[PDB]
Design a protein around this ligand. Sequence first.
Ligand SMILES: O=C(O)CCC1CCNCC1
Length: 79
Amino acid sequence: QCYHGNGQSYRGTFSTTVTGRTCQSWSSMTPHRHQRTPENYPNDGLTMNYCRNPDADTGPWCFTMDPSIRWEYCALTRC
Ligand SMILES: O=C(O)CCC1CCNCC1
């Protein structure tokens, strides 16, 4: 599955990182405490634990459910 451009506007349901880790939900502070929440960023599609690029990175990403890995890019290709 692919994303367009830098993935900022990707709104798909992929939730797996490039190392096979599972994305943390954006609204959750567990395991990673963060500020990129749908409450703060209501228009970036920060739904469940779906891969997103709300901060002008270069591809969709997420905080990971591994407490030792803050975040990773998602295992998506560029369209
Ligand atoms: O630690 C955080 O809150 C975010 C770290 C990076 C998330 C991926 N894009 C660059 C910043």
